[PDB]
Amino acid sequence: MRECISIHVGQAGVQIGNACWELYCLEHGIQPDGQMPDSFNTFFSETGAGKHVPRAVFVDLEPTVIDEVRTGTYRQLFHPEQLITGKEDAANNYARGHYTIGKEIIDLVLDRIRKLADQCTGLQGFLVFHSFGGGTGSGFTSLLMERLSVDYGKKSKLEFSIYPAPQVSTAVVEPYNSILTTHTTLEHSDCAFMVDNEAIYDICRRNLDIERPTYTNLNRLISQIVSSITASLRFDGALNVDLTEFQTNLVPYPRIHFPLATYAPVISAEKAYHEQLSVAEITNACFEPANQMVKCDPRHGKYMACCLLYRGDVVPKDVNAAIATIKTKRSIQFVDWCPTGFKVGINYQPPTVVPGGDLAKVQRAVCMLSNTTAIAEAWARLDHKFDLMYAKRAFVHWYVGEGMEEGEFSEAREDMAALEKDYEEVGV
Amino acid sequence: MREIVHIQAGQCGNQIGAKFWEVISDEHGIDPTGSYHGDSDLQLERINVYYNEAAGNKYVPRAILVDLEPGTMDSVRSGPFGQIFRPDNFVFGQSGAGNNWAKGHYTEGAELVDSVLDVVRKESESCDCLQGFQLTHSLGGGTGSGMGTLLISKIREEYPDRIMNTFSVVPSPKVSDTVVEPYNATLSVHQLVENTDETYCIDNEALYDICFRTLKLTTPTYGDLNHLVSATMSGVTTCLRFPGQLNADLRKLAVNMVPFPRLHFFMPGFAPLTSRGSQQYRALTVPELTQQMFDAKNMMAACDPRHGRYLTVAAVFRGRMSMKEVDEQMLNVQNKNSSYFVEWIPNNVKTAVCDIPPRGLKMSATFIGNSTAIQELFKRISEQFTAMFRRKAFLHWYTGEGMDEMEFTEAESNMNDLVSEYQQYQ
Amino acid sequence: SSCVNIKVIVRCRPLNEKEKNDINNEEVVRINNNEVILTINRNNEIYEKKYSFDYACDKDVDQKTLFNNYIYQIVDEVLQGFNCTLFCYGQTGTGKTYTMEGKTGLIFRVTKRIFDILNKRKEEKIMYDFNIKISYLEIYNEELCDLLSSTMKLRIYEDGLNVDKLEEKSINSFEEIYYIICSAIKKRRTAETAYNKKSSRSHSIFTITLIIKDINESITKIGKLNLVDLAGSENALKSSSLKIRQQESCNINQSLLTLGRVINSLIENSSYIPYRDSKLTRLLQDSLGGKTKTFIVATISPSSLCIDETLSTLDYVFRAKNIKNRPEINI
Ligand SMILES: Nc1nc2c(ncn2[C@@H]2O[C@H](COP(=O)(O)CP(=O)(O)OP(=O)(O)O)[C@@H](O)[C@H]2O)c(=O)[nH]1
Ligand SMILES: Nc1nc2c(ncn2[C@@H]2O[C@H](COP(=O)(O)OP(=O)(O)OP(=O)(O)O)[C@@H](O)[C@H]2O)c(=O)[nH]1
Ligand SMILES: Nc1ncnc2c1ncn2[C@@H]1O[C@H](COP(=O)(O)OP(=O)(O)NP(=O)(O)O)[C@@H](O)[C@H]1O
Ligand SMILES: [Mg+2]
Ligand SMILES: [Mg+2]
Ligand SMILES: [Mg+2]
């Protein structure tokens, strides 16, 4: 009876979105035209005899992003009302994305979301794919978070946010968009994930043997995590941990709501014939810094809260041993304020990979999600990039000219300082 | 969506513009008759950005021809795709600036331009979602420069919310043109700076060298120089024609390329750029594109980057490239050549990716950017100008048209300010 | 030969009717001898933030008090022959337009005191001529416009600067000045908006050139004085004309950004001051570390509703106290 509505905003949100929907479609066997030859309603509402439709809205200002969607293989699946754009891009400028032109489609998105919400009986909440700094992926995100806070409030506000990497980037005003995106995000989100484009390429080339990975590879690893986290909304397990149970237990303080994550095992088809993929080895793999989806190093922080979501051929006894094994790893520092061990969920449904993909199918898998002081590292690097650009007022005239007060940047910076402080104090 | 209007400022704009349209027409599958006979819907999805749709499934170049030379008019009417181009856009007067910018701006240009603008208005009112204008002209020429400068100012007043993208031929250290080239250029630059958002400078000597040396076209004719220029213009317009892994636009470039309003000048180049025999000695991989893109000697400018600092670079790629492949090459370049990039920005390279290659290449890319090396342009104009001006050489050409010497003083000062900003960032 | 610091005054506005009706901290910020102290509650912590100015005027201090002190001192220096600039800063809604007119404010009290004294100087006379001329200009939609002309064609060029085709008027009497100011105001581009009532759609520039033959050694002094209602810092949505008032707001904010960058450049002693970039800052060329003595008039609200705006204003202005110049007597 649990239901979820998702938003795919900005080109990246849409591309991840499409990947997530291909996987959701795959997992249940829905055909490209909506036919199939239940829990399926969590993501794909029955609409009529012979057809189910995915509960999602794709949002941007670039007509191109949606035009691409409109020609895709699922164009027969999504109702046309689910694809919404404005006329002009944000020029990677928060001022445009949020205040001046983001306004073009606020009502349209609200119309579609409200219609989907009115069609739900057990809406757990919303799942949004967006950026931590990048045009409409910041802009609409800000506009839509204000509206979701007002229109729903109590419904879950869960998001996956694309993180600019220490080296991987596409533009130069990204730290301005990020400091503003984050400031706004902190006042509306219940829980969000940090997703690092650089780290994900490293996983693709080191774990999946992809010599030179691209966006179409990065999106697959992301969809594996999205699936595992939301799998419990629809599939039975030994330990039926609810998505909101999970968020509640993971966040000990209101300001610590941005967990880091990994997934294991991540293997190539060749590794599929060599790896000793036991419950314990997979669990152990989840705690190696090398496998994280964010370029942070946990040895420089403390684990505040963590949840291990096991999938497939996993026996709770194996898990108890696996957890006991992790408990002996003295190299893993846990926050001094949390005697509580791991929260564990175990889903009966095995993971799946996508045909034409990369990751090989396994009998057992674990999704690991955690809150740690170490994430401060990620935020600090964005602030260092920001301080240089801001101090020189480089390109500031574009923000100001497109609809922004220069002072907003200092408001955001102060809050980012608070953000770092929040992680430090809970670490201390 | 996001439509562009083009202006061909006299023969400069017409020779460059004509080649632009031959190339773009081929890119969109447009027949010499104007009808579409291409390969893919992608060629139609954005065709209206550059063409006017018509019965017969025709796509008419959305451009206005402007000059005071009726000989040019007839020459253009007689050329390729002339039968497609809308006859109403041949906006030619009958006189000529005579290499006198004031005559070409204050007097003859002043009369011509109101006719041109009535045409521009009718063309813009025929658009649904006009993003901007693109105009090609020279700085030191006569009618071309006069009308170019004049239209840019008047168009900017009428369309303050549109993009003004200017391509222009600028003064060379040796291969000069008019006897007052520095005067005309001084006057033009001053007026252009306050109206243009984005501009690309074209140095003919560089085009000649690239053709002579790079392409081994040791007889570097005007037709060959047009290949290089039209290829660049085509490169710049990729974002409004075909999609890919990293979608982009002109406004994104402005926001991420101009850190300070006066730093809007570009010194472009592209890759692969090879000869024919050389096709047996290459490997069209991103590292190859990268080496050519960041080759200081591969730019269409005398403003060699090794004597300046990059302020901001845009690397626009076309074809199904690996993003890790591209990202690592862009990072490797900045790390290796960090001594050539401004310390004001903790990332000096912007990346955009179209998955559709240009016709004939497995991979291609366009390299544009703003650099402090640009001050060499303004210093050349200023030195050539100040030397002639202090002798009041040809001064009667301008005072006879009502120009106060003050206009030149202000213009010279303006160029000194453009130089000063390049120096502050170096 | 040494440069000296520019001077600054900070004034608090009385609470608006809206501010009095709303529930907020009526006095989040308070003023001491020259200290401006504000209490802020953020991220569940309370801090005391503060800045110091040269002059200050709390909500309990009127224009008469300022007249006998702030205006008094400035006008004497203008009459001494110092080239002087009076400029200002604040967010929109702060009150500075109100105080320019006193709806009797700065343009009237400052000008009246100058001309009253000059009239007393005429009484002292009884070649001591008063070759006095004035002009009113405004920058509207980024176009300098002549408020003294008939039914924007103003070239800004070297003297310092001069404006091609600018109408200038001579002065024989204050009464004429009054009529001229009033006429200039009627021609001024202003507006009523969602929140504010005397929107300044332009940067309003008032210039007085006092060529006074204060001879003994025939000496003439030119007491140039520039009073400018620089537009304040805005938020279009905050007030909520499709595309005109938004454009003005943006152009204004860009103007202020630029002025800011110029101030910062002057503070950091850069090798080039980008005042040459914007026409506003070009018009301010000699105020920007030159021979013109300058003063900053800043205005803030006492209410907690404007803490972010207030602190941004006070920080800008306080930082600006690091600007120095070499004020001279125009002899
Ligand atoms: N790269 C190219 N440069 C050219 C071409 N044709 C001319 N030029 C260069 O431009 C300059 C001559 O300019 P134009 O014939 O365009 C002067 P225009 O006709 O615009 O005005 P008039 O003064 O009325 O002739 C000079 O530097 C030539 O060497 C061309 O096809 N390609
Ligand atoms: N993981 C992932 N990241 C992407 C993808 N496409 C773009 N990005 C990242 O997203 C950021 C750029 O933002 P975009 O989403 O392209 O921009 P946008 O939201 O469309 O905003 P505008 O184009 O400025 O209107 C960069 O950090 C890119 O690396 C993708 O398919 N997968
Ligand atoms: N000290 C004051 N006492 C009483 N009323 C005031 C005071 N200051 C401002 N106001 C009133 O508030 C309204 C004015 O806003 P002002 O006109 O003060 O805004 P402003 O800062 O000039 N806004 P803007 O012109 O948009 O940059 C006026 O009608 C004034 O009467
Ligand atoms: Mg986009
Ligand atoms: Mg010609
Ligand atoms: Mg006002």
Side-chain angles (χ1 to χ4, degrees):
Chain A
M1 294 299 291
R2 292 172 291 194
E3 295 171 81
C4 181
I5 297 169
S6 63
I7 299 170
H8 307 286
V9 59
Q11 180 189 328
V14 171
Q15 293 293 312
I16 293 169
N18 288 339
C20 289
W21 285 111
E22 180 175 359
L23 179 59
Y24 284 127
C25 289
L26 177 64
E27 289 172 343
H28 296 283
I30 194 168
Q31 301 297 300
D33 63 359
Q35 295 186 85
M36 182 180 291
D38 195 351
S39 64
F40 188 52
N41 286 320
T42 297
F43 294 108
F44 297 79
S45 178
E46 186 177 2
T47 61
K51 188 169 188 176
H52 293 257
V53 176
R55 298 179 189 279
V57 178
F58 295 78
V59 179
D60 208 320
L61 296 174
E62 290 185 326
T64 298
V65 171
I66 295 302
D67 287 340
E68 291 168 355
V69 172
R70 289 171 174 148
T71 62
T73 61
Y74 294 109
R75 68 188 181 276
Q76 294 178 328
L77 178 61
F78 289 86
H79 187 286
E81 72 184 353
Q82 295 178 259
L83 305 179
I84 301 170
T85 72
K87 294 182 179 178
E88 295 183 7
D89 63 280
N92 195 17
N93 182 339
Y94 189 84
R96 288 174 64 86
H98 186 171
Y99 308 113
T100 300
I101 61 171
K103 185 176 179 180
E104 289 180 357
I105 59 170
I106 292 168
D107 289 343
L108 291 173
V109 174
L110 291 172
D111 182 62
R112 275 52 165 171
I113 295 299
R114 290 172 183 166
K115 289 177 180 177
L116 290 171
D118 289 344
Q119 295 171 343
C120 299
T121 61
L123 182 66
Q124 67 87 31
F126 300 91
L127 179 63
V128 179
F129 295 86
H130 69 95
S131 173
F132 281 125
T136 58
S138 292
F140 284 114
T141 298
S142 296
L143 291 171
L144 294 176
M145 288 189 294
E146 181 179 0
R147 292 294 184 186
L148 292 173
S149 296
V150 173
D151 289 348
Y152 301 99
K154 292 180 180 179
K155 297 296 187 186
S156 175
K157 300 173 295 300
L158 180 66
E159 304 92 40
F160 288 81
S161 301
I162 298 169
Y163 176 69
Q167 295 179 102
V168 175
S169 67
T170 63
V172 300
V173 301
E174 290 175 0
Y176 289 120
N177 290 339
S178 292
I179 200 167
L180 295 173
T181 299
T182 301
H183 183 198
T184 299
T185 299
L186 290 171
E187 302 302 312
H188 298 289
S189 295
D190 296 308
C191 184
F193 304 88
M194 180 176 281
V195 180
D196 182 323
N197 286 336
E198 182 171 344
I200 297 168
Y201 287 123
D202 287 343
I203 293 168
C204 287
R205 69 187 177 87
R206 182 177 63 77
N207 285 335
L208 297 175
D209 298 340
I210 305 301
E211 183 179 4
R212 294 291 182 271
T214 189
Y215 285 130
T216 62
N217 292 102
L218 298 180
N219 290 336
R220 291 170 181 158
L221 290 174
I222 293 167
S223 70
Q224 290 295 313
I225 292 170
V226 171
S227 175
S228 294
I229 292 170
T230 61
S232 69
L233 292 174
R234 53 180 167 153
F235 296 110
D236 290 343
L239 303 175
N240 289 310
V241 176
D242 191 74
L243 185 58
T244 62
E245 179 179 353
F246 177 76
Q247 291 176 42
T248 298
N249 288 326
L250 291 171
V251 179
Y253 300 91
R255 302 288 292 184
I256 308 299
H257 57 272
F258 298 93
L260 301 178
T262 190
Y263 183 79
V266 180
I267 62 170
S268 69
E270 181 64 23
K271 291 180 183 178
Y273 299 106
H274 301 290
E275 295 291 309
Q276 301 298 297
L277 299 177
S278 68
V279 171
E281 289 295 309
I282 293 167
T283 300
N284 289 338
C286 287
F287 294 94
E288 184 180 359
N291 293 316
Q292 304 297 307
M293 297 290 283
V294 178
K295 297 292 284 182
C296 296
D297 184 336
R299 293 175 294 177
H300 298 83
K302 299 183 186 176
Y303 284 77
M304 292 175 66
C306 179
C307 172
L308 296 171
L309 301 177
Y310 289 81
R311 295 186 68 170
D313 188 20
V314 178
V315 178
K317 291 179 180 179
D318 291 335
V319 172
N320 289 336
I323 298 301
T325 299
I326 297 301
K327 290 179 179 179
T328 63
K329 294 183 177 295
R330 290 178 180 174
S331 68
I332 301 171
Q333 180 70 58
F334 295 89
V335 70
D336 291 339
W337 296 107
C338 185
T340 301
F342 291 96
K343 175 70 174 180
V344 176
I346 301 172
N347 201 281
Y348 289 136
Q349 176 68 51
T352 187
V353 300
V354 178
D358 55 14
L359 177 66
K361 185 176 180 180
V362 300
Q363 292 181 334
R364 285 161 287 282
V366 180
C367 179
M368 185 280 274
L369 184 65
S370 66
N371 286 311
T372 179
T373 301
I375 195 169
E377 184 182 0
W379 295 117
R381 288 173 287 184
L382 291 175
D383 288 344
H384 292 303
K385 291 178 185 293
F386 174 80
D387 286 346
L388 176 60
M389 292 298 288
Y390 180 69
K392 298 297 187 187
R393 274 75 182 172
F395 306 100
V396 170
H397 71 103
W398 287 110
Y399 284 88
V400 172
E402 294 291 325
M404 183 178 293
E405 186 176 27
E406 182 184 7
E408 292 181 52
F409 284 117
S410 68
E411 293 176 6
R413 188 181 188 276
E414 182 176 45
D415 206 65
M416 296 303 100
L419 178 61
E420 182 177 357
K421 179 175 173 176
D422 289 340
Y423 292 110
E424 181 177 359
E425 290 183 343
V426 301
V428 177
Chain B
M1 298 298 293
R2 304 178 299 166
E3 295 176 286
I4 302 296
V5 176
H6 290 258
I7 298 173
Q8 296 178 197
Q11 287 181 317
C12 181
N14 289 329
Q15 293 297 313
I16 292 169
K19 185 61 66 175
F20 172 81
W21 290 115
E22 293 177 5
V23 172
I24 296 300
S25 296
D26 195 66
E27 287 276 298
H28 289 283
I30 299 170
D31 192 81
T33 60
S35 293
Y36 174 79
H37 299 288
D39 297 309
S40 175
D41 289 346
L42 292 175
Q43 292 174 305
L44 296 177
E45 290 181 358
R46 295 293 180 267
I47 199 164
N48 287 338
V49 173
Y50 296 110
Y51 298 87
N52 291 322
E53 184 174 349
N57 197 27
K58 294 184 178 180
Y59 298 99
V60 178
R62 185 174 302 111
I64 300 168
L65 308 176
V66 178
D67 209 320
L68 295 170
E69 294 181 342
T72 298
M73 179 180 65
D74 289 343
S75 295
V76 173
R77 288 175 174 164
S78 298
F81 302 101
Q83 69 185 340
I84 299 168
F85 186 84
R86 180 180 174 180
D88 290 340
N89 287 331
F90 286 84
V91 184
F92 292 84
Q94 295 183 38
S95 65
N99 304 322
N100 182 335
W101 182 91
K103 182 175 178 178
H105 190 269
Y106 293 166
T107 301
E108 294 295 308
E111 292 181 357
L112 177 62
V113 72
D114 289 345
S115 294
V116 174
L117 291 172
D118 190 70
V119 173
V120 171
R121 288 191 293 270
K122 287 178 166 60
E123 189 68 46
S124 71
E125 293 175 2
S126 299
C127 294
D128 296 311
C129 187
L130 182 65
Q131 185 174 65
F133 296 86
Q134 187 174 128
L135 185 152
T136 300
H137 69 91
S138 64
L139 291 176
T143 300
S145 180
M147 290 304 298
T149 303
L150 182 59
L151 285 168
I152 291 168
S153 179
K154 287 171 170 269
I155 292 168
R156 171 58 73 194
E157 292 175 351
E158 290 181 336
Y159 302 94
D161 56 353
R162 271 70 171 184
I163 297 172
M164 181 66 74
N165 185 341
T166 300
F167 286 80
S168 66
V169 177
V170 302
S172 296
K174 292 181 180 179
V175 182
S176 70
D177 183 17
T178 64
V179 299
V180 294
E181 183 180 7
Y183 289 70
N184 287 342
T186 296
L187 293 168
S188 182
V189 170
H190 179 71
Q191 293 298 327
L192 291 172
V193 170
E194 294 181 3
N195 294 286
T196 297
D197 295 304
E198 178 182 357
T199 182
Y200 298 80
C201 297
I202 300 170
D203 288 333
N204 287 338
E205 291 182 5
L207 292 171
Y208 282 120
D209 188 67
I210 292 168
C211 287
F212 181 90
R213 180 181 64 81
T214 298
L215 303 177
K216 301 187 185 304
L217 301 177
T218 59
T219 56
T221 64
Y222 283 132
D224 298 306
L225 300 184
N226 285 335
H227 173 75
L228 292 173
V229 175
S230 65
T232 299
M233 291 173 71
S234 296
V236 171
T237 64
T238 300
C239 65
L240 299 179
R241 293 188 289 108
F242 296 97
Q245 289 171 88
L246 294 171
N247 289 324
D249 203 342
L250 293 173
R251 290 186 185 278
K252 288 173 66 172
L253 291 171
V255 171
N256 289 272
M257 296 298 288
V258 181
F260 181 85
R262 291 176 183 266
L263 303 178
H264 60 275
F265 296 86
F266 295 90
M267 298 293 173
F270 64 96
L273 183 60
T274 75
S275 189
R276 182 175 178 183
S278 66
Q279 292 175 340
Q280 301 301 310
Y281 302 98
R282 296 290 184 272
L284 280 70
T285 63
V286 171
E288 180 172 290
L289 292 171
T290 299
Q291 290 173 345
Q292 292 181 40
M293 289 173 73
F294 288 91
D295 182 354
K297 295 188 288 189
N298 193 44
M299 300 294 103
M300 280 76 76
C303 298
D304 184 326
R306 292 173 293 176
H307 298 287
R309 295 290 183 272
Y310 291 104
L311 299 183
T312 304
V313 174
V316 179
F317 296 89
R318 296 186 66 177
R320 295 180 180 181
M321 299 178 196
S322 166
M323 293 298 98
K324 180 66 170 173
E325 180 187 8
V326 172
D327 288 342
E328 292 297 305
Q329 291 295 308
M330 295 301 97
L331 292 171
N332 287 337
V333 170
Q334 290 184 69
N335 288 336
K336 290 179 180 180
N337 291 286
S338 67
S339 68
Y340 296 101
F341 294 87
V342 71
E343 294 179 357
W344 292 36
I345 301 172
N347 181 25
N348 293 282
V349 178
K350 183 180 182 301
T351 300
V353 179
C354 176
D355 293 348
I356 294 83
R359 185 177 182 183
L361 299 173
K362 290 179 180 179
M363 293 188 177
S364 73
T366 300
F367 179 99
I368 64 170
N370 183 266
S371 173
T372 65
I374 292 171
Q375 69 180 300
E376 293 299 316
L377 173 60
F378 291 114
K379 289 189 290 184
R380 289 194 299 275
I381 294 168
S382 296
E383 291 176 351
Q384 291 172 341
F385 174 74
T386 200
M388 292 179 184
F389 183 72
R390 67 185 63 192
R391 296 176 67 190
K392 299 187 185 294
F394 309 105
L395 188 58
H396 292 170
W397 290 26
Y398 299 99
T399 61
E401 297 295 324
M403 183 176 289
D404 196 285
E405 292 185 18
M406 178 180 65
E407 183 68 19
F408 287 107
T409 298
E410 292 171 1
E412 185 174 358
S413 296
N414 187 64
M415 290 188 288
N416 288 337
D417 287 334
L418 292 172
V419 171
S420 296
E421 288 295 346
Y422 284 121
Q423 291 179 350
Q424 290 298 306
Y425 283 76
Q426 182 177 4
Chain C
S1 66
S2 178
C3 296
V4 299
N5 294 77
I6 64 170
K7 300 295 183 179
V8 57
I9 185 165
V10 176
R11 185 169 188 267
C12 295
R13 194 187 68 191
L15 293 174
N16 195 2
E17 293 300 312
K18 184 66 163 70
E19 289 178 313
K20 290 186 287 185
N21 289 335
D22 288 345
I23 304 301
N24 58 74
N25 185 340
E26 291 177 351
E27 298 183 4
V28 76
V29 59
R30 66 185 187 273
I31 298 174
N32 293 328
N33 288 338
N34 63 322
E35 296 178 332
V36 179
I37 301 172
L38 180 149
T39 299
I40 184 168
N41 185 338
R42 176 161 292 164
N43 298 119
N44 299 320
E45 295 181 309
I46 298 171
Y47 298 88
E48 180 177 272
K49 294 183 175 181
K50 59 191 176 187
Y51 301 96
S52 297
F53 300 96
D54 299 308
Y55 301 88
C57 182
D58 206 337
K59 69 181 176 68
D60 297 334
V61 178
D62 65 13
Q63 294 298 312
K64 291 178 181 178
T65 300
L66 292 173
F67 179 76
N68 289 325
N69 288 279
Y70 184 72
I71 293 169
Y72 173 88
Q73 187 64 46
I74 292 168
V75 171
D76 288 346
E77 295 178 16
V78 171
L79 293 174
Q80 291 173 339
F82 281 105
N83 292 318
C84 289
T85 299
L86 303 177
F87 68 96
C88 64
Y89 188 80
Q91 71 266 35
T92 184
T94 54
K96 65 188 183 64
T97 300
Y98 172 90
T99 64
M100 291 296 176
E101 296 172 2
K103 295 291 179 59
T104 300
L106 291 172
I107 195 169
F108 290 108
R109 287 184 181 275
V110 172
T111 301
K112 183 176 179 180
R113 189 173 187 270
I114 291 168
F115 283 86
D116 182 67
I117 293 168
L118 290 170
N119 287 336
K120 287 176 164 58
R121 183 62 176 158
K122 292 175 183 176
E123 293 174 351
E124 293 179 1
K125 181 180 179 178
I126 294 168
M127 296 181 288
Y128 292 97
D129 294 333
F130 295 76
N131 187 7
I132 300 169
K133 65 179 184 176
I134 61 173
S135 64
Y136 298 79
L137 303 90
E138 66 179 347
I139 302 171
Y140 175 65
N141 293 338
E142 298 184 343
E143 295 181 348
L144 186 66
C145 288
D146 187 348
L147 292 173
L148 297 179
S149 186
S150 183
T151 61
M152 73 292 293
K153 183 175 180 178
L154 297 181
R155 183 188 292 268
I156 299 170
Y157 69 96
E158 68 181 1
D159 190 278
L161 300 172
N162 189 262
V163 178
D164 186 66
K165 307 297 186 287
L166 181 65
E167 184 70 11
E168 296 179 339
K169 303 293 186 184
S170 68
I171 298 172
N172 298 274
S173 67
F174 188 82
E175 183 177 2
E176 290 174 325
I177 293 168
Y178 179 78
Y179 292 152
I180 293 168
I181 292 168
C182 288
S183 296
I185 291 169
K186 290 178 181 179
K187 294 177 180 176
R188 194 174 63 194
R189 298 288 185 181
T190 66
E192 185 178 0
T193 188
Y195 284 77
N196 301 312
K197 301 302 183 186
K198 298 164 177 55
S199 177
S200 294
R201 299 176 67 185
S202 66
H203 299 292
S204 174
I205 301 169
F206 176 41
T207 298
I208 300 171
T209 301
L210 300 177
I211 303 170
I212 308 302
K213 297 180 184 174
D214 283 321
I215 63 171
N216 206 339
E217 296 178 354
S218 296
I219 299 170
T220 299
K221 292 182 177 177
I222 303 173
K224 292 183 179 181
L225 176 64
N226 298 292
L227 176 63
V228 180
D229 186 15
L230 292 172
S233 173
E234 297 192 22
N235 178 318
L237 291 181
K238 184 177 179 180
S239 64
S240 190
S241 176
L242 185 67
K243 294 177 74 175
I244 302 300
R245 291 188 180 174
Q246 297 176 306
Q247 285 177 4
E248 291 165 354
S249 72
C250 291
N251 291 341
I252 292 168
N253 289 339
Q254 291 176 66
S255 296
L256 293 174
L257 176 62
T258 299
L259 181 60
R261 290 180 291 174
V262 171
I263 291 168
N264 290 338
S265 296
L266 290 169
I267 292 168
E268 299 297 326
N269 298 316
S270 69
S271 64
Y272 181 78
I273 306 300
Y275 75 86
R276 291 185 181 184
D277 182 56
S278 173
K279 290 178 182 177
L280 177 61
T281 57
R282 291 179 75 91
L283 291 173
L284 299 174
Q285 175 182 43
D286 195 56
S287 298
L288 298 174
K291 293 182 179 178
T292 297
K293 186 176 286 192
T294 67
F295 300 88
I296 300 170
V297 179
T299 302
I300 62 172
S301 173
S303 175
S304 67
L305 293 175
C306 299
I307 291 169
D308 287 338
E309 295 171 1
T310 298
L311 291 174
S312 296
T313 299
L314 293 173
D315 194 76
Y316 176 94
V317 173
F318 179 78
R319 178 175 169 82
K321 292 180 98 298
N322 291 330
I323 299 297
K324 295 184 180 179
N325 59 40
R326 294 183 176 88
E328 295 290 343
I329 303 298
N330 190 331
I331 299 171

